[PDB]
């Protein structure tokens, strides 16, 4: 927050920004160790510097601002004279914008730079201006009459022919157009053009729209995001200008209570309650048909219904086939009443201050009620990745909400039968009103007036939706994507792989993406697209030599779901299966990555039902190849059914997929068997959960 922003230009005329870095105090020195890690001292020559910011005095008085270099030119408030010495009458707590400019060929490299020193004198007392009185500019305040990177300077005349030249920062977001178009990085408020060696050191390559101050369409500018100057409750992956700050509030059920009495405050009547699990993505994956074969490199799957993490499915547990109505004795035409234990969540990147969600409780298409939770009853604010009630505490009962304090949610006799038939209660959050956080004064977050409504729509119109589903947590993102048909759309082009990396802060290991310890490469996950996204990806895959979905360009409107497997092995470092695959030979480098299972005969895994969830649809996937023979691989899965299929591998790796289903907890082991013939290679065997099934 404190200090001034230094703009260091390679040229003499403040045009070619080499380094943007904050200085501490009037000494105008930056953090040299951090700049060193980003600058090559043989390529660090600068010929003009500008420092900008705000002076806030701690005492009214007549301040004389000066610099040890007569060369330097200063201005205060864009209103004072432009001079090496300024006499300003300042008031306590008032803000005085300051612009210090130095032009000097033979200024030297950034390392050897003897920067000027900024002093001020009050009552004849001359001192270096302390850090506590120097503040950076409000870079969220885009002032057309005071641009962050002006196209003119205090030293050079505004030439007539110099008209019609390009702006340095066309959208006035404080990132030069050359930076945005070609790539930059910001770490510790230090900004520089991108170099590919920065990736090895862990710096993130930022690109953004040089014509859009808010490329993602969210409340924060490209610089606010890239620099991390926004609300610290925003997830760090939203620092990327192409990853929107975007709250995604939903609610899931973990207990369903059905009573014959409508009154929440009544201990009379018959009541049946059952624990429930919930899924933020089941409505998405339940509409996925699984093919055994994949063609033309398209190793992903299509869902008929791309639902977001706001549409939550409910699975009733420990039912034992006992109908809901046996414990209620409700008759045809009568109604029982629903109470539930619910938990709100935020799978997005931004907090929802004053969270006011609207959720439809849906059963087989029927809206049983519309829950209108008030912020005062759900923790006021819901931060990304958090829940209300908080993760460790008991879930919120609907009856304690003001809406249901007097009466519960009625449910019909016929709707009770649908519940027995296996129809799942959906909690579909349709809209969430709320506010975002902007800083104020000493760095405090201010929320009121900052409605999310218009930004939510704006973000959605220029973005792709990417959902990452792990067992523990689901993450939904909005990544800005270009309209490839719009010739004037200056949104940076991302591959799907680059977008996934940015959206989730994924790391890389041997070029493949990792989400913490989970591999999320396309060969280690179940990618799920809607029909329109899948058709675009299939067409793009036909234009690539290296046919990888992650190399396909991201287009706006795309809907992408990454379902990480429950169990996975790459036959290398990773094998979290709960049983041992038999007859495994990994003494080779013939895998899709690293080693493969060189299958000489039969490989078998026996998985107890203690290691799988009951009444779920699973897909067993993997990659196979056979370089010198076309030997059929026999695949046999023994679950709720016993099915056998004959698989033909090619010389290169191809994907196979087989769906299977679990039943009760007391079921026999799930057995998966693959039989090869000597030169069969297997890799990246996964078991992924898809959806619940009726009981």
């Amino acid at each position: 927050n404190n200090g001034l922003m230094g703009y260091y230009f390679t040229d003499e005329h403040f045009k070619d920004l080499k380094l943007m870095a904050p200085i501490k105090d009037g000494n105008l020195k930056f953090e040299e160790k951090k700049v060193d890690k980003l600058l090559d001292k043989d390529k660090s020559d600068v010929k003009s510097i500008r420092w900008t910011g705000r002076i806030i005095p701690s005492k009214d008085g007549e301040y004389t601002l000066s610099t040890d270099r007569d060369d330097v030119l200063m201005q205060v408030n864009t209103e004072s004279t432009i001079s090496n010495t300024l006499k300003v009458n300042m008031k306590k707590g008032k803000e005085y914008k300051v612009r210090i400019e130095l032009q000097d060929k033979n200024l030297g490299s950034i390392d050897n730079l003897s920067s000027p020193n900024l002093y001020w004198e009050l009552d004849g007392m001359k001192k270096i201006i302390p850090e506590e009185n120097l503040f950076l500019r409000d870079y969220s305040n885009i002032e057309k009459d005071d641009p962050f990177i002006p196209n003119n300077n205090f030293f050079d005349p505004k030439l007539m022919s110099d008209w019609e030249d390009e702006d340095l920062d066309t959208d006035n977001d404080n990132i030069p157009d050359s930076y945005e178009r070609n790539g930059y990085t910001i770490k510790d408020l230090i900004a520089v053009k991108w170099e590919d060696s920065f990736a090895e050191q862990g710096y993130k390559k930022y690109v953004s729209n040089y014509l859009e101050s808010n490329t993602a369409g969210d409340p924060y500018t490209d610089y606010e995001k890239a620099s991390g100057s926004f609300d610290k409750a925003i997830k760090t992956e939203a620092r990327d200008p192409l990853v929107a700050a975007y709250p995604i509030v939903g609610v899931g059920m973990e207990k369903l209570i059905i009573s014959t009495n409508e009154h929440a405050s009544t201990d009379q009547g018959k009541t049946v309650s059952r624990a429930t699990t919930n899924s933020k993505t089941e409505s998405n994956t339940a509409g996925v048909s699984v093919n055994v074969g994949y063609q033309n490199g398209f190793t992903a799957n299509v869902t008929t219904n791309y639902s977001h993490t706001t549409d939550n499915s409910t699975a009733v547990q420990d039912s034992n086939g006992e109908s809901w109505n046996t414990g209620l004795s409700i008759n045809k035409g009568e109604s029982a009443y629903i109470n539930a234990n619910v938990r709100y969540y935020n799978t997005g990147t931004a907090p929802m201050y004053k969270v006011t969600p609207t959720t439809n409780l849906v059963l087989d298409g029927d809206t049983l009620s519309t829950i209108k939770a008030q912020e005062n009853q759900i923790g006021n604010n819901l931060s990304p990745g958090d829940t209300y009630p908080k993760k460790g505490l008991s879930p919120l009962a609907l009856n304690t909400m003001d809406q249901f304090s007097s009466r519960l949610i009625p449910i019909n006799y016929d709707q009770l039968k649908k519940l027995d038939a296996g129809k799942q209660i959906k909690l579909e959050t349709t809209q969430v009103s709320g506010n975002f956080g902007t800083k104020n004064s000493s760095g405090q977050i201010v929320t009121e007036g900052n409605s999310w409504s218009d930004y939510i729509s704006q973000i959605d119109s220029i973005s792709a939706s990417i959902i990452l589903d792990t067992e523990n947590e689901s993450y939904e993102r909005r990544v800005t994507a270009k309209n490839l048909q719009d010739p004037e759309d200056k949104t940076p082009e991302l591959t799907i792989g680059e977008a996934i990396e940015k959206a989730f802060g994924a790391t890389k290991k041997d070029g493949l993406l990792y989400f913490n310890d989970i591999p999320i490469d396309e060969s280690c996950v179940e990618l799920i697209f809607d029909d329109n996204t899948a058709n675009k990806i299939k067409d793009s895959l036909k234009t690539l030599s290296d046919k990888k979905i992650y190399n396909v360009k991201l287009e706006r409107g795309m809907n992408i779901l990454i379902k990480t497997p429950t169990y996975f092995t790459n036959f290398d470092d990773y094998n979290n299966y709960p049983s041992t695959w038999s007859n495994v030979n990994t003494t080779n480098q013939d895998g899709l990555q690293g080693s493969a299972n060189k299958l000489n005969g039969e490989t078998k895994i026996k998985i107890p039902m203690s290691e799988l969830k009951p009444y779920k649809r699973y897909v067993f996937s993997g990659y196979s190849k056979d370089p010198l023979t076309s030997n059929s691989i026999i695949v046999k899965i023994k679950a709720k059914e016993e099915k056998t299929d004959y698989l033909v591998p090619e010389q290169g790796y191809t994907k196979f997929s087989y769906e299977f289903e679990t039943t009760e907890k007391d079921s026999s082991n799930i057995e998966i068997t693959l039989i090869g013939s000597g030169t069969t290679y297997l890799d990246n065997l996964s078991i992924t959960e898809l959806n619940s099934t009726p009981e």
Partner: antibody
Amino acid sequence: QIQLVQSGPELKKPGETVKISCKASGYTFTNYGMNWVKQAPGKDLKWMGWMSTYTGEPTYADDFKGRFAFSLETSASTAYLQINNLKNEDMATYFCARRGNYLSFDYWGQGTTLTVSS
Amino acid sequence: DIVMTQSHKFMSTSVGDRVSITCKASQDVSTAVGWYQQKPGQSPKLLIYSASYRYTGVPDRFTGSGSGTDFTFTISSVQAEDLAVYYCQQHYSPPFTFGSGTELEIKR
């Protein structure tokens, strides 16, 4: 990096109940199970069973069916081992150990000694 | 239950000597054998996994060999910090039996 941190040493009377906790960090808790291992003063390392952090279902070794209960707090990345109706034979050091890659016990807790005495 | 029978309860050695511990599995465990080191009062530490794969950060004086039922753990040059108990363990199928352990001791 990956750390398994167990609760401190326990002193219990015979017939009492004790609950050992095992907090995991540095890895996705629900992607790997949790083994529990007993080491009696003079005996070898004995596998007590494991807890699936994916299903929440425990599996118990034959010698530990009855008085032993594994439980889960996924929101705290914590596994628990409860022993009811304590006997002197329960005096041992108890370890949690990740059901790691290829079912190897690749990360171990520091151990929890349990002293049973009247 | 797959039983892991280890070579010697006690093994006397000198610092800088070579020692090998064998372990016989009661049935085929392919390569699913681990070797653990335990110093007094500490938890076991995985040294070798999958019979031969050195674990992260493990010195290269520790090596593992074998497949099927016969397995060897070797310290090419014993260091004073290696005086501890070493267990073989099958991590093939429960109950993941541990060997009875081999204590390294200084010969005199």
